[PDB]
């Protein structure tokens, strides 16, 4: 224990400068303590990564950040005590994420990269684009300020940017006073919710918030009949002869915000307007209805609705959030009378995924076990994180005072005197604020392991081999990718044989003598899970008082049915054309659109312009921008006198050269047409002479299949002087160069395998698949869809951001876009909490006396394909362009904010929720643009100020 006192030297690449000439015994990598000998402040441990004798004697230089963290004054005394790396080993380390999507495999790589390292508090750990942060270091159950991480330290990951779901049970107890003189709703909203929001603000979290209000209502009706046939689709019968209907109201959906205190007023307003909304009063054409009790409510179906919406995390995947959270707030104490099979189903869905459910009861803590299920017997649920929110004399009671119902053998009696939820351990009154502010991910490792002989009585034994070795990925990164691929499916390792466990399924992945062996064990008798058909009424977020009947199937996925043997082949082929992505695998997918940058009109609207119909309804300049963008995507007379002039190195055309796999003197089959109609008479003549030139067999296309005709556009061509591989490595887009008032009439997708490891930042190959529109036009959006399984999401996000910047330079927009914005909850792209908005288009003012509705001059045959053009003529005035998605017509705004559908009288309106703040720009407007567009569009569609007829009359003239 040397006590060589020193003098501090401040420094501003390892953040520690020392001289071996001053510490000859200290080698590279050794720990170097730095603390003032006479300071009560905690010491500071670090690493001596590098050696440089030029550092001053009796002086060790460190960075400013670590010095400010450890509270070390400049020029002060210090110590240089060196301890062995076996005493300061930490016991538990915690890292948190922020505004980043990280798969479990990436977390595994980050953790195994951090091993055997010195880490202090609030350090910035970065690795291959992943950016974590230490926030709590524990040694022997004591919080420390710094420590060392060994091959046995506990690492925990949490998130500040999860996806949260909040449910509030509005049962009858919401309207009851508690023992302190306050309503239960006031306790829930003015209490718990405000505290949670304040904690989120304090901890700097950026979750995505969805808020739903739900209840259940019974009716006094004999045999249906009374219900108007229009709402009869959402009536269910209890097994006691009762007519009840479930209700759901959405307050906010998929919303990100910097403050949440402004939402409580909205929830209060909904509380006031509630009893009429759920048909307890003014039940016109309805029987008399009654609210339900919390124990008789629909608690177990809100959980399964959340499980449904969370089971589709792979669809429309974005790069900003990580983590899932579902919260149920109830006025009761934690007793419910639920169905017997739904409980087993929701337990199975709980044990399948890794999204733990949270319950926050608000009644007084009872004198028994909590929570309680009264089957239609009792059962204690051990998989619910429950809590009791105690609001901010003595002797608080613990029993609910029931309301008032309005109006011989004398020696034996003495002798015979001295002759479940019982353990109600009343201690859980705490509220786990830490689990509500930074949700913890599913642990990467587990300790449980069954008996070495009990597997024969429960599971079979499947086995398959793989030889990855037979620039190429070595047969050691493939094994790591094998281990990773299980992780994003929800697997955990048990604590180079690697065991893995998920539910009842077991995997073993091993490597030996350059060969990867996989062995699967699946249960012999997997419990069946019959789907539950569920019906409910839903009020969408944009709506005000409108309910829509919906139906949903509760099902449990068959984990043993996952085709784990095809995905391994896909990985082992490094994106070969032999194997592709099939829908059975839940491969991650996203969809982007490239749009014209109509900046002027959007800026005018954003500045305060009233009507948005100002979008109307230079070509080669935009063509140049598009060809430049596509180039960025790829990372790059008569007879023969014209050809000879083209071959001139300064007169004819450019020469695309200096590219791997690209033949010299190659040229783009589009710019040559532009120069030809310039130096040398018409576009048709240009393409015809180009086709003749190809027929002359001196200039062809680089693919080599000269049989194909000349295609004008972004196509590669060589001069002078196999097919699938070229089509799978380069982009190639063609160029396809009033209606409702007239006498007459009154491929498409290509695939490319991309390498993601641009600006190399990792030791392994990453690849994805890209499906893009086969042809481009200035009146239709350009669709590009990414499908990926094995990609570091940060690298892909960096590449996509590069694309976004390049397209911004070219006068376009590249925006992520929802996939199924008009699907019902039952379909794959549907959303149980989303329903389309309807806009009525009244054809009544347009109609004139005489002819009934319209199109009287036109033949009745052209009526089902001509009104469609009339509607699109109105749509084009609002910036909506056609979207030929990969059926019903779809239109998307140039801002990329709003969708539009023609049902087959009116429109279907929906929002694009995948446009976040980061993607926003000048062209896309502010965060309140779609809402202000709804108002103008709806008002124009009802012919406000006779704006509609002003359009019909003004367009009728062109017919004449």
């Amino acid at each position: 224990r040397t006590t060589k006192v020193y003098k501090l030297v401040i420094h501003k690449d390892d953040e520690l400068v020392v001289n071996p000439k001053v510490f000859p015994h200290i080698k590279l990598g050794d720990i170097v303590e730095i603390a003032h000998p006479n300071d009560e402040y905690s010491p500071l441990l670090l690493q001596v990564k590098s050696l440089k004798e030029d550092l001053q004697k009796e002086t060790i230089s460190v960075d400013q950040t670590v010095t400010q963290v450890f509270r070390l004054r400049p020029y002060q005394d210090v110590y240089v005590n060196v301890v062995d790396p076996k005493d300061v080993t930490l016991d538990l380390v915690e890292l948190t994420f922020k505004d980043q999507y990280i798969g479990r495999g990436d977390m595994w790589r980050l953790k195994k990269s951090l091993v055997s390292t010195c880490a202090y508090i609030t350090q910035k750990v970065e690795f291959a684009g992943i950016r974590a942060q230490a926030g709590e270091l524990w040694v022997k159950n004591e919080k420390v300020m710094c420590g060392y991480i060994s091959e046995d330290t506990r690492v925990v990951f949490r998130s500040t940017s999860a996806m949260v779901y909040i449910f509030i049970q509005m049962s009858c107890e919401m309207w009851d006073f508690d023992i302190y003189g306050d309503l239960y709703f006031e306790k829930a909203v003015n209490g718990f919710l405000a505290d949670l929001f304040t904690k989120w603000k304090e901890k700097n979290c950026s979750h995505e918030v969805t808020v739903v209000l739900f209840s259940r209502t019974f009716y006094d009706a004999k045999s249906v009949d009374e219900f108007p046939e229009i709402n009869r689709a959402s009536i269910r019968q209890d097994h006691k002869g009762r007519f009840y209907e479930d209700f759901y109201k959405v307050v906010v959906q998929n919303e990100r915000r910097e403050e949440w205190t402004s939402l409580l007023v909205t929830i209060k307003k909904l509380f006031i307007q509630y009893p009429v909304l759920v048909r307890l009063e003014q039940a016109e054409g309805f029987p008399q209805g009654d609210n339900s009790t919390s124990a008789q409510g629909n608690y177990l179906e809100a959980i399964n609705l959340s499980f449904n919406v969370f089971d589709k995390h792979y669809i429309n995947r974005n790069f900003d959030r990580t983590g899932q959270m579902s919260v149920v707030i109830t006025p009761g104490v934690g007793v419910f009378e639920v169905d017997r099979l739904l409980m087993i189903l929701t337990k199975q869905r709980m044990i399948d995924n890794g999204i733990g459910v949270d319950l926050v009861c608000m009644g007084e803590q009872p004198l028994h076990a909590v929570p309680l299920f009264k089957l239609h017997d009792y059962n204690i649920p051990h998989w619910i994180n429950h809590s009791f929110y105690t609001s901010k004399n003595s002797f608080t009671p613990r029993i609910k005072l029931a309301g008032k119902k309005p109006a011989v053998d004398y020696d034996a009696y003495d002798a015979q005197v001295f002759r479940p939820v019982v353990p109600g351990f009343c201690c859980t009154v705490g509220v786990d604020w830490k689990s509500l502010t930074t949700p913890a991910c599913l642990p990467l490792t587990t300790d449980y392991f069954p008996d070495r002989q009990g597997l024969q009585n429960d599971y079979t034994e499947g086995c398959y081999d793989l030889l990855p070795e037979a620039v190429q990925m070595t047969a050691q990164q493939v094994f790591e990718e094998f281990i990773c691929q299980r992780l994003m499916q929800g697997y955990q390792i048990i604590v180079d044989q690697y065991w893995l466990s998920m539910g009842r399924t077991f995997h073993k992945v091993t490597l030996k003598d350059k060969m990867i062996t996989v062995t699967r064990y699946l249960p012999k008798y997997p419990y069946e899970s019959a789907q539950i058909h569920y019906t409910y009424s839903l009020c969408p977020s944009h709506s005000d008082s409108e309910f829509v009947s919906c139906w949903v199937e509760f099902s449990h996925e068959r984990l043993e049915e996952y085709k784990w043997n095809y995905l391994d082949q896909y990985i082992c082929s490094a994106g070969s054309e032999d194997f592709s992505l099939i829908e059975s695998l839940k491969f991650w997918r996203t969809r982007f659109l490239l749009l014209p940058a109509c900046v002027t009109a959007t800026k005018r609207i954003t500045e305060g312009e009233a009507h948005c119909d100002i979008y109307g309804d230079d070509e080669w300049q935009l063509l140049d921008g598009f060809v430049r963008f596509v180039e960025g995507l790829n990372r790059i007379s008569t007879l023969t006198e014209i050809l000879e002039a083209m071959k001139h190195p300064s007169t004819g055309v450019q020469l695309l050269s200096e590219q791997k796999g690209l033949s010299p003197y190659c040229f783009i089959s589009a710019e040559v047409v532009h120069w030809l109609v310039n130096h040398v008479q018409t576009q048709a003549m240009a393409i015809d002479i180009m086709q003749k030139m190809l027929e002359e067999q001196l200039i062809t296309h680089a693919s080599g299949e000269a049989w194909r005709t000349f295609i004008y556009g972004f196509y590669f061509y060589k001069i002078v002087t196999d097919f699938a591989s070229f089509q799978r490595k380069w982009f190639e887009v063609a160029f396809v160069a009033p209606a409702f008032l007239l006498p007459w009439l009154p491929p498409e997708q290509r695939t490319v395998t991309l390498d993601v490891d641009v600006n190399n930042r990792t030791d392994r190959l990453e690849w994805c698949s890209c499906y893009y529109h086969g042809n481009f036009s200035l009146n239709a959006a350009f669709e590009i869809k990414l499908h990926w399984m094995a990609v570091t999401a940060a690298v892909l996000f960096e590449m996509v951001q590069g694309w976004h910047r390049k397209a911004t330079s070219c006068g376009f927009l590249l925006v992520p876009v929802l996939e199924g914005p008009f699907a019902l909850p039952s379909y794959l792209y549907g959303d149980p909490l989303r329903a389309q908005l309807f806009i009525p288009l009244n054809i009544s003012c347009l109609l004139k006396e005489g002819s009934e509705h319209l199109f009287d001059s036109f033949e009745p045959e052209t009526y089902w394909d001509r009104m469609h053009l009339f509607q699109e003529a109105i749509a084009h005035r609002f910036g909506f362009v056609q979207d030929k998605y990969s059926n019903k017509p779809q239109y998307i705004h140039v801002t990329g904010t709003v969708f539009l559908q023609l049902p087959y009288v009116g429109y279907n309106w929906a929002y694009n929720t995948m446009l976040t703040k980061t993607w926003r720009s000048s062209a896309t407007g502010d965060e309140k643009f779609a809402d202000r567009l709804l108002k103008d569009f709806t008002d124009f569609c009802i012919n406000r100020d006779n704006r509609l007829v002003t359009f019909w009359t003004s367009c009728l003239e062109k017919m004449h």
Partner: protein, 363 residues
Amino acid sequence: CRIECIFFSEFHPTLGPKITYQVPEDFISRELFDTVQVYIITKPELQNKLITVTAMEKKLIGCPVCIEHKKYSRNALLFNLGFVCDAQAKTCALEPIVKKLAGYLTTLELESSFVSMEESKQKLVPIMTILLEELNASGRCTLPIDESNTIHLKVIEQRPDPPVAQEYDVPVFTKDKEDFFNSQWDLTTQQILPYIDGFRHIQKISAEADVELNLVRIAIQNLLYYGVVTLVSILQYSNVYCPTPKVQDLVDDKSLQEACLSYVTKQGHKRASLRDVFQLYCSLSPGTTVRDLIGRHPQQLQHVDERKLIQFGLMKNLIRRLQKYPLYTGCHSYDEICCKTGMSYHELDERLENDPNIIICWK
């Protein structure tokens, strides 16, 4: 708990603190307000604290509220809406109402600026004009103010803290039951209610109902707190009771006579007289057990239940209990010792009758 007036005041920037509204009008005279003015509109350190001040035979309750923001005159707004009662009113249950009301007012001002401008200020007078009657006559008030806020007030009386229930006590019903919705009980109260009869001690209840003893004791304590059940000593044919002076009151209070004669009366018999009851409550002796009286007053016990007789005497304090005090630390009754040991009192009799080391005492 009557409310004489409800008054609203605030920090007027020009004339300083003064009253602004009263219901009824001019109930609080200015020369009275200008004295309690220090405790009504207070220094910032006193905000969000209940203040009860007695002056001029009146009792003023309030809770000053200060909201600090730049938009106001002096970067803060001061207001208080308080109650007036008589000097001797038991206003211990009127504090939560005032606190919640102040919370409602500050929420209204923070959300809709309800108190700042003079347009919504005039709406206060009908609000208090409703509050006074809704609270005095009913003690409950549900009053909507706007599209997001509705005032819900319910007054709760603060009953005294309950005693502790020991393992050997016997609970007896005093509200007669069958007057409440069993569905509205704590679901563990429903477990034990069919076992309370007036003859079962807490340990026996826990044994029969398979409920944790600590939980059963807490439940019985809660029932005591609400006043639904009472506790009496164990009943056995070897107890000894000494009459209490209050026995005389039995003959000098007609209501007590009626209640006693009704309760003590055997079911299925003519109502017992008072001459056969005042004798039973004076013929007991510290040397006569409940067994000698079976033959000592045979004619008298022909319309009464002996168990019910003794029970009723116990609850109304017409009878005291005599036990035996000898693990024999001294502070243990015979019944408690028997219950912990698990043997009968007669079994304990042939365990200290002939083993002289520690003697028997009656207290």
